[PDB]
Amino acid sequence: RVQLAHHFSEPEITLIIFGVMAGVIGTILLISYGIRRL
Amino acid sequence: RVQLAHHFSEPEITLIIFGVMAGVIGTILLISYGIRRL
């Protein structure tokens, strides 16, 4: 798993973060709801 | 430059899905650990 070519790439950085951010937060909310049962 | 050499591209959707997928699953695992308290 070694990289090559000294330079920046994958400009979709923000996208990756946003996705994980939305998913993580989403699961938390849903999960928190299960514990309550209501 | 033609054929082979991993034809470049410009994805997006996949990235968004992967991110949310990793984040969601990640939170679940961590959360599940808290409920166990061990």
> Is A13's Cβ below 8 Å from some Cβ in B?
no
In angstroms, the CA A35 to CA A28 distance is: 11
Q: Among candidates B15, B37, B30, B22, which has minimal Cα distance to A28?
A: B30
In angstroms, the CA B31 to CA A30 distance is: 12
Partner-chain residue, chosen from A12, A16, A27, that has the shortest CB–CB distance to B24:
A27
In angstroms, the CA A2 to CA A4 distance is: 7
In angstroms, the CA A6 to CA A8 distance is: 7
Q: Among candidates B24, B21, B15, which has minimal Cα distance to A12?
A: B15
In chain B, the N- to C-terminal Cα span, in Å, equals 56
Place of tokens 């996705």: A19
Contacts of A22 (CB under 8 A, 6+ apart): B20, B23
Experiment type: NMR
Chain B positions touching A33 (Cβ under 8 A) are: none
